[PDB]
Amino acid sequence: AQSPATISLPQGGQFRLSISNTDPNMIFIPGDKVTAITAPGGMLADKRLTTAGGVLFTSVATRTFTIFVETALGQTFSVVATPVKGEGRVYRLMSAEPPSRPETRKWETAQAYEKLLISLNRAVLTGDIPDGYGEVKPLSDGIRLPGGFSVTPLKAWAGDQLRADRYELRNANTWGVALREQDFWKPGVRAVMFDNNAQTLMGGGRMTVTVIRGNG
């Protein structure tokens, strides 16, 4: 039914959540696969690593403890659980700092630069994300604001080089302005694309933009 509950969790962060002592739970990471979990303090019943890349567990205690979930790409998080009555839950993890994937390094350095930017841009536009690119938390304030605009991040994809983002531009003003692509530049942005080829908005906020940052 619901969207999975999503959280931030920098490398080795803590987050306060609640789990159910019946109804086995699940924690899964997009872009990776969990290979270890060690959650003493409350002595969970059992652990089972699925094939998607999540981990299934269930507790029977009645007090707060800690759970250490560890990934394969050298990512380590920590969630402070609390057993409750029922209705088993599913959470999503979202590393705010992209990991390192040397396969993606050799894949990226294999080809040229401009064709690489074109590859990433078309993979963002269509939807088919390349193999080797994860999905990391969308960073705020990664672009300039030339005038009264209201940005709202949507999603981000990243690995080892050229982290890619997606934003939204809305004209909070009353008239129509000029959208020059070089206004939304910062020290670190490598490319900017306007999704619909509109030379000037009207006043309604339905314009998105893709930004290809670096050091992802």
For tokens 């409350």, name the residue.
Answer: 42
Site membership for a copy of itself, residue 128 (CB under 8 A):
no
Nearer to another protein by Cβ, of 53 and 153: the residue is 53
Residue 47 corresponds to which amino acid?
K
Stretch that binds a copy of itself, among 83-91, 123-131, 132-140, 194-202 (CB under 8 A): 83-91
Q: What sign does the dihedral 129-130-136-137 (CA atoms) show?
A: negative
Q: Which of 142, 123, 120 is nearest to 189 (CA)?
A: 142
Calculate ∠ Cα 35-47-32, nearest 5°. Answer: 25
Comparing CA positions, the residue from 67, 63, 60 lying closest to residue 40 is 67
Site for another protein in 105-144 (CB under 8 A): 106-111, 113-115, 117-118, 121-122, 125-126
Task: Label residue 67 exposed, middle or buried (CB < 10 Å: 0-12, 13-18, 19+).
Answer: buried
Q: With beta carbons less than 8 A apart as the criterion, state whether 34 and 28 touch.
A: yes
Q: Mark the segment that binds a copy of itself (CB under 8 A) among 73-81, 128-136, 139-147, 169-177.
A: 73-81
Mask 184-213, x = binds another protein (CB under 8 A)? -x-xxxxxxxxx-x-x--------------
Please tell me what DSSP assigns to residue 67: B
CB of 26 to a copy of itself, least distance (A): 7
User: Among 44-52, 124-132, 152-160, 197-205, which window interacts with a copy of itself (CB under 8 A)?
Assistant: 44-52
Neighbour tally for 79: CB within 10 Å? 20
Tokens of 171: 């004209």
**CB of 199: closest distance to another protein in angstroms?**
8
The reply on whether position 65 binds a copy of itself by CB under 8 A is yes
CA 39 to chain centre: 25
- Rule CB under 8 A: which residues touch a copy of itself? 1-4, 7-16, 22-24, 26, 28, 30, 35-36, 38, 40-41, 46, 48, 50-54, 56, 58, 64-66, 68, 70-72, 74-76, 78, 80, 86-90, 92, 107-115, 161
- Rule CB under 8 A: which residues touch another protein? 24, 34-40, 43-49, 55-56, 58-60, 106-111, 113-115, 117-118, 121-122, 125-126, 161-162, 181-182, 185, 187-195, 197, 199, 214
